Design an enzyme around this catalytic site. Structure first.
Site, mmCIF file in Angstrom:
data_model
loop_
_atom_site.group_PDB
_atom_site.id
_atom_site.type_symbol
_atom_site.label_atom_id
_atom_site.label_comp_id
_atom_site.label_asym_id
_atom_site.label_seq_id
_atom_site.Cartn_x
_atom_site.Cartn_y
_atom_site.Cartn_z
ATOM 1 C CG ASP A 1 -1.505 1.103 0.788
ATOM 2 O OD1 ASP A 1 -1.777 1.850 0.112
ATOM 3 O OD2 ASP A 1 -3.520 0.669 2.159
ATOM 4 C CB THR B 1 -6.697 1.984 -0.577
ATOM 5 O OG1 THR B 1 -5.379 2.000 0.125
ATOM 6 C CG2 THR B 1 -5.964 -0.318 -0.326
ATOM 7 C CG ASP C 1 -2.423 0.742 -3.105
ATOM 8 O OD1 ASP C 1 -1.641 1.399 -2.703
ATOM 9 O OD2 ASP C 1 -3.389 0.316 -2.278
ATOM 10 C CG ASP D 1 -18.950 8.068 -24.727
ATOM 11 O OD1 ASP D 1 -19.974 7.290 -24.161
ATOM 12 O OD2 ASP D 1 -18.326 8.255 -23.200
ATOM 13 C CG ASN E 1 -24.105 6.289 -22.998
ATOM 14 O OD1 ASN E 1 -23.246 6.111 -23.973
ATOM 15 N ND2 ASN E 1 -24.827 5.293 -23.682
ATOM 16 C CG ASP F 1 -23.435 8.401 -28.119
ATOM 17 O OD1 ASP F 1 -22.675 7.497 -27.312
ATOM 18 O OD2 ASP F 1 -23.344 9.319 -27.758
HETATM 19 N N1 LIG Z 1 -7.055 -6.876 5.101
HETATM 20 C C1 LIG Z 1 -7.168 -6.864 3.227
HETATM 21 O O1 LIG Z 1 -6.574 -8.204 3.832
HETATM 22 N N2 LIG Z 1 -6.375 -6.370 2.409
HETATM 23 C C2 LIG Z 1 -6.508 -4.143 3.149
HETATM 24 C C3 LIG Z 1 -8.223 -3.881 2.608
HETATM 25 C C4 LIG Z 1 -7.747 -3.510 0.974
HETATM 26 C C5 LIG Z 1 -8.064 -4.644 0.168
HETATM 27 C C6 LIG Z 1 -7.214 -5.803 0.533
HETATM 28 N N3 LIG Z 1 -7.085 -6.699 -0.441
HETATM 29 C C7 LIG Z 1 -6.943 -7.850 -1.011
HETATM 30 C C8 LIG Z 1 -5.911 -8.062 -2.165
HETATM 31 C C9 LIG Z 1 -5.042 -7.851 -0.811
HETATM 32 C C10 LIG Z 1 -3.538 -8.220 -1.945
HETATM 33 C C11 LIG Z 1 -3.696 -7.838 -3.458
HETATM 34 C C12 LIG Z 1 -4.783 -7.748 -3.936
HETATM 35 O O2 LIG Z 1 -5.068 -7.926 -4.958
HETATM 36 C C13 LIG Z 1 -5.389 -8.282 -6.439
HETATM 37 F F1 LIG Z 1 -6.431 -9.619 -6.363
HETATM 38 F F2 LIG Z 1 -5.083 -8.012 -7.066
HETATM 39 F F3 LIG Z 1 -3.668 -9.389 -6.013
HETATM 40 C C14 LIG Z 1 -6.159 -7.859 -2.638
HETATM 41 C C15 LIG Z 1 -8.375 -5.968 -1.289
HETATM 42 C C16 LIG Z 1 -9.116 -6.254 -2.963
HETATM 43 C C17 LIG Z 1 -10.265 -5.319 -3.327
HETATM 44 C C18 LIG Z 1 -10.354 -3.930 -3.111
HETATM 45 C C19 LIG Z 1 -9.835 -4.023 -1.175
HETATM 46 C C20 LIG Z 1 -8.477 -4.854 -0.759
HETATM 47 C C21 LIG Z 1 -6.473 -6.008 1.343
HETATM 48 CA CA LIG Z 2 -3.894 2.126 -0.827
HETATM 49 CA CA LIG Z 3 -22.006 5.887 -25.443
HETATM 50 ZN ZN LIG Z 4 -3.233 6.035 2.612
#
Ligand SMILES: NC(=O)N1CCCc2c(n(Cc3cccc(OC(F)(F)F)c3)c3ccccc23)C1
Ligand SMILES: [Ca+2]
Ligand SMILES: [Ca+2]
Ligand SMILES: [Zn+2]
Ligand SMILES: *[C@@H]1O[C@H](CO)[C@@H](O[C@@H]2O[C@H](CO)[C@@H](O[C@@H]3O[C@H](CO[C@H]4O[C@H](CO)[C@@H](O)[C@H](O[C@H]5O[C@H](CO)[C@@H](O)[C@H](O)[C@@H]5O[C@H]5O[C@H](CO)[C@@H](O)[C@H](O)[C@@H]5O)[C@@H]4O)[C@@H](O)[C@H](O[C@H]4O[C@H](CO)[C@@H](O)[C@H](O)[C@@H]4O[C@H]4O[C@H](CO)[C@@H](O)[C@H](O)[C@@H]4O)[C@@H]3O)[C@H](O)[C@H]2NC(C)=O)[C@H](O)[C@H]1NC(C)=O
Ligand SMILES: [Cl-]
Ligand SMILES: [K+]
Ligand code: NA
EC number: 3.1.4.39
Length: 805
Positions: free
Chosen positions: A121, A159, A308, A683, A685, A691
């Site tokens: 992160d 994030t 990210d 575009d 919409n 479109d």
């Molecule tokens: N507590 C936690 O485990 N996390 C912190 C909170 C935000 C968060 C995490 N993940 C999971 C995640 C972890 C590592 C790579 C990743 O991305 C990939 F799937 F592409 F690999 C995805 C999310 C997936 C979608 C949206 C938000 C989050 C993680």
């Molecule tokens: Ca982040």
């Molecule tokens: Ca359109």
């Molecule tokens: Zn942050």
């Protein structure tokens, strides 16, 4: 309710989550207040910490220890990650020379190389160079594997939108996670970082990688970790899963670190406090790689190290307050910070009006550090409009700034020194990509690319078919040693007509006029060849674009340009022309100032007319091929054909005329010739897609001439600028833009000044990928080059950002 009186014995970090009110032992149980009574005791052991020491070697197994140094630990799959180093005289992974991994070297029973996604992160792209002395494990992954100088996140650079974009290949407007905070008016419900609503599956659209894998019979580790589980325990849990029997073992895993973001917010991106968090992340990577090496998996697993978003310097004093602009501040709700989203506080207040809010927020202060937009007017490259959770009114906040509603919000909520969320072209928001393993290339640097592309590649790494997404599958094939995806070009759906001279001048009653009636076999055969396509190889360098939808259109040839003229929209879909370094700019001669000439190849019924423009007091017209760049006084007459005309607001004509008269020549000088393709976009919409006819909301008054929402240009030349655009033997170079077709220049605060002070800055804001234009037009470009198709796909996803180094 959770009956938390079951037990986690033999269940620690179980892969399938059991249903209520049975108690849970999975890596998310803490987040749902749902773990069994003995979860901490059994599953979160800490005794003796995370490293073997000389005196622990060969110890008698003590099941209370966090990890083990006993002789049986390797086959239990639960040694401390430094076991073989401390106790068996092995080296740390980081101290080994890198050796090319030409083939997977996997234990028997591995069906495929596992994929480990190590996500960090707030890991700003420049940390790879600036923190390199303190990150030796990461530096080794980087130098030995495949890496990009940076990876572009999606907007907003927060994030949740970015991790779910990584997971799905989708823009936030499509996957539905459009910020860290959201109101959905259909659900009448709010999504927030803290709280329970975010766990409801109705927020989360598309199909993430873990679901993609499971549906196709590839087992996935759970990607989420409750926050209180330490990093060392996450790594050990992954390593333990990798020791499961073949039938039970996942093929894909994720690790997530809240660092360096957590510290970056407190100390700013380069605060002296940031060194330690970088060292600690590197140590975690070291633990993983030592752990894989122990399991004989370090030349088997593909590892992705990815961030990210980055982190910018932002402090409380650099906050703009809406209360300094708006009288009615209490009638609005603002989503604040590094972007703004405004909607009415109350839907019962029919005196709320977005038009007057935008106006009160437009160019009001000399150095104003945000710019208001209706969402459909945001740069199309952001793809940030087609979702009911994205408020109509948006504020693009300058890097280094915040927006808030009232000062009390900032002090009754300086703490922070860092933040992120800004426009995803901002250098400080760029993040990192490294791929290391048998499927990635060895010691290879690749150009920067967008994170929307990675889902496809993760699917390729696991032999999965990706769900439909916004990546361009194949554009990242140059990252990979094997498992490439070899797409075929889409088939053209509509073939062009090639009309000859079919109409006499007097059949046209368009209300157009031109002073062109001034009368030779030498030049008569010559004009004829040009209308048949004799100069076409010069102006159409990469073949004609393919039309990927059903429509009726004509190819029109001219000395200086070639066009694909739509009989349906009454204007070109595209106009292609080449300007050499040597080309000269001329003016529109006096007697030709208001000249529009009927095109005797195209029926009056399929033509625009001048009377409509006279009658429409708001709308004027411009030309796609610019008369300024005509090759000769005689060729110039072609530029005034009614078939080269397009509807343009006078305010937009300022922009367009400066681009055509000044900038095209400038680029041809700098790039050694350019090929230009320009055209309209519709575009209405704001879904980022072409479109159909029945979607057009505005016509030139009293006619069927549709008004474009945007105008594009694709500007191509030789990457080796020692060769002219029209004689290029190798790779191409491109920049493009999608300019909004607006009736005012309110977007540009300095527009009362000369175009030389504001137009190019506007165009840079509206920079675009060729791919963005493809979606918006249903055209497919670069059909005929000597280049490999994957290389062309990469070129079509290129974005020219205009940021410095
Ligand atoms: N507590 C936690 O485990 N996390 C912190 C909170 C935000 C968060 C995490 N993940 C999971 C995640 C972890 C590592 C790579 C990743 O991305 C990939 F799937 F592409 F690999 C995805 C999310 C997936 C979608 C949206 C938000 C989050 C993680
Ligand atoms: Ca982040
Ligand atoms: Ca359109
Ligand atoms: Zn942050
Ligand atoms: C980036 O990549 C993505 C993925 O490829 C591209 O998005 C696709 O674009 C398609 C065209 O816009 C679209 O296809 C439509 O599917 C409709 C059914 O959709 C549901 O099922 C799928 C499959 O599982 C699912 O993915 C959808 O998920 C959306 O909605 C849910 C719930 O709201 C969300 O959780 C999720 O996040 C996602 O939302 C996003 O997409 C929708 C649009 O579907 C937006 O409204 C949201 O804002 C958000 O961005 C759905 O659950 C289907 O209904 C459509 O069919 C219409 O048109 C066809 C012509 O083929 C015709 O047969 C019918 O007449 C029909 O029209 C009828 O409905 C109209 C509207 O009510 C009405 O006017 C008519 O009178 C008719 O009654 C259509 O085929 C596809 O769903 C999405 N997929 C995703 C994931 O977004 C995206 O275009 C790419 N972007 C760029 C710039 O390239
Ligand atoms: Cl947000
Ligand atoms: K007019
Ligand atoms: Na202005």
């Amino acid at each position: 309710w959770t009956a938390t009186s079951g037990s986690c014995k033999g269940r620690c970090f179980e892969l399938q989550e059991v249903g209520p009110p049975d108690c849970r032992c999975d890596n998310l149980c803490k987040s749902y207040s749902s773990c069994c009574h003995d979860f901490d005791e059994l599953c979160l052991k800490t005794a003796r910490g995370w490293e073997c020491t000389k005196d622990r070697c060969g110890e008698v197994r003590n099941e209370e220890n966090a990890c083990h140094c006993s002789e049986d630990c390797l086959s239990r799959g639960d040694c401390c990650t430094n076991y073989q180093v401390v106790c068996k005289g092995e080296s740390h992974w980081v101290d080994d020379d890198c050796e090319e991994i030409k083939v997977p070297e996997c234990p028997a029973g591995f069906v495929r190389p596992p994929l480990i996604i190590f996500s960090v992160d707030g890991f700003r792209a420049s940390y790879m160079k600036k923190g390199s002395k303190v990150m030796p494990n990461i530096e080794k992954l980087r130098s030995c594997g495949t890496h990009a100088p940076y990876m572009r996140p999606v907007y907003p650079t927060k994030t949740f939108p970015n991790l779910y974009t990584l997971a799905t290949g989708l823009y936030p407007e499509s996957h539905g996670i459009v910020g860290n905070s959201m109101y959905d008016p259909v659900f009448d419900a709010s999504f927030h970082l803290r709280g329970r609503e975010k766990f409801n599956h109705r927020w989360w659209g598309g199909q993430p990688l873990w679901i993609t894998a499971t549906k196709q019979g590839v087992r996935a580790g759970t990607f989420f970790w409750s926050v209180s589980i330490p990093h060392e325990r996450r790594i050990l849990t992954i390593l333990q899963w990798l020791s499961l029997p073949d039938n039970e073992r996942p093929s894909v895993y994720a690790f997530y670190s809240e660092q360096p973001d957590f510290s970056g917010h407190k100390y700013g991106p380069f605060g002296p406090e940031m060194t330690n968090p970088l060292r600690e992340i590197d140590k975690t990577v070291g633990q993983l790689m030592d752990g894989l090496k122990q399991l004989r998996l370090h030349r088997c697993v593909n590892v992705i190290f990815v961030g990210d978003h980055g982190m910018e310097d932002v402090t409380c004093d650099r906050t703009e307050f809406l209360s300094n602009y708006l009288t009615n501040v209490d009638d609005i709700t603002l989503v604040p910070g590094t972007l703004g989203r405004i909607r009415a506080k109350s839907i019962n207040n029919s005196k709320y009006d977005p038009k007057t809010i935008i106006a009160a927020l437009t160019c009001k202060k000399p150095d104003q550090h945000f710019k208001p937009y209706m969402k459909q007017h945001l740069p199309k490259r952001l793809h940030y409009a087609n979702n009911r959770r994205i408020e109509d009114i948006h504020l693009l906040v300058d890097r280094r700034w915040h927006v808030a509603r009232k000062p009390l919000d900032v002090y009754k909520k300086c703490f922070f020194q860092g933040d992120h969320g800004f426009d995803n072209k901002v250098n400080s928001m760029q993040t990192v990509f490294v791929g290391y393993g048998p499927t990635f290339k060895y010691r290879t640097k690749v150009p920067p690319f967008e994170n929307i592309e990675l889902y496809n590649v993760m699917c390729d790494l696991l032999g999965l078919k990706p769900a439909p997404n916004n990546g361009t599958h194949g554009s990242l094939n140059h990252l990979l040693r094997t498992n490439t995806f070899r797409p075929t070009m889409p088939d053209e759906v509509s073939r062009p007509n090639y009309p000859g001279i079919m109409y006499l001048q007097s059949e046209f009653d368009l209300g157009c006029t031109c002073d062109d009636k001034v009368e030779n076999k030498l030049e008569e055969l010559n004009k004829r060849l040009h209308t048949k396509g004799s100069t076409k190889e010069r102006h159409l360098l990469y073949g004609r674009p393919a039309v990927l939808y059903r429509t009726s259109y004509d190819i029109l040839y001219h000395t200086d340009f070639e066009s694909g003229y739509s009989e349906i929209f009454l204007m070109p879909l595209w106009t292609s022309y080449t300007i050499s370094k040597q080309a000269e700019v001329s003016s529109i001669p006096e007697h030709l100032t208001n000249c529009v000439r009927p095109d005797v190849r195209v029926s009056p019924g399929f033509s625009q007319n001048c009377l409509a423009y006279k009658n429409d007091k708001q709308m004027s017209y411009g030309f796609l091929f610019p008369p300024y760049l005509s090759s000769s006084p005689e060729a110039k007459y072609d530029a005034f054909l009614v078939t080269n005309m397009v509807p343009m607001y006078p305010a937009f004509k300022r922009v367009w005329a400066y681009f055509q008269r000044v900038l095209v020549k400038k680029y041809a000088s700098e790039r050694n010739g350019v090929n230009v393709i320009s055209g309209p976009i519709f575009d209405y919409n704001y879904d980022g897609l072409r479109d159909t006819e029945d979607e057009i909301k505005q016509y030139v008054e009293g006619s069927s001439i549709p008004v474009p929402t945007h105008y594009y240009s694709i500007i191509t030349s030789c990457l080796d600028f020692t060769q002219p655009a029209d004689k290029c033997d190798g790779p191409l170079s491109v920049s493009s833009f999608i300019l909004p077709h607006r009736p005012d220049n309110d977007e540009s605060c300095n527009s009362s000044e000369d175009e030389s002070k504001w137009v190019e800055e506007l165009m840079k804001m509206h920079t675009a990928r060729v791919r963005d234009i493809e979606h918006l037009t249903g055209l497919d470009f670069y059909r005929k080059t000597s280049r490999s198709y994957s290389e062309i796909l990469t070129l079509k996803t290129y974005l020219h950002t205009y940021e410095s180094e």
